[PDB]
Design a protein that fits this description.
Layout: E1 13-21, E2 24-30, E3 45-50, E4 61-62, E5 69-73, E6 80-81, E7 84-88, E8 102-103
Antiparallel strand pairs: 1-2, 2-5, 3-4, 3-7, 6-8
Length: about 110
């Protein structure tokens, strides 16, 4: 993809999804770019995207929140969803970090028996 000449922004890490509820998930990550202390003193913003696995192809949804984390809500129960956190500084940006798959809990519930 790139020999080295170029040098676009680098994607975040530690991208993980913490299933709390049927429509609640925690998306925390890290930015090796940040200085010693974990504090975004820069004027940037993070954009986390997420979509459904069915149908395979579906409009990719994204949000806007400047932080090293993100709490997704309004999702569907027992449904496969994607998650990716990237960094953008206006003109420059980084690819989509390791797409973490988070399967929420079942809402409907089991049947009598």
């Amino acid at each position: 993809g790139s020999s080295g000449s170029s040098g676009p922004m680098m994607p975040p890490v530690g991208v993980q999804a913490s299933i709390l509820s049927h429509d609640t998930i925690r998306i925390t990550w890290a930015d090796n770019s940040l200085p010693k202390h974990q504090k975004i003193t820069d004027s940037r913003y993070y954009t986390v995207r997420w979509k459904t696995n069915i149908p395979a192809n579906t409009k990719y949804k994204n949000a806007n929140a400047t932080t090293l984390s993100y709490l997704v809500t309004g999702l569907k129960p027992n449904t496969l969803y994607e998650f990716s956190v990237m960094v953008t500084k206006g003109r420059r940006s980084s690819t989509w970090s390791m797409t973490a798959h988070g399967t929420t809990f079942e809402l409907s519930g089991p049947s009598s028996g």
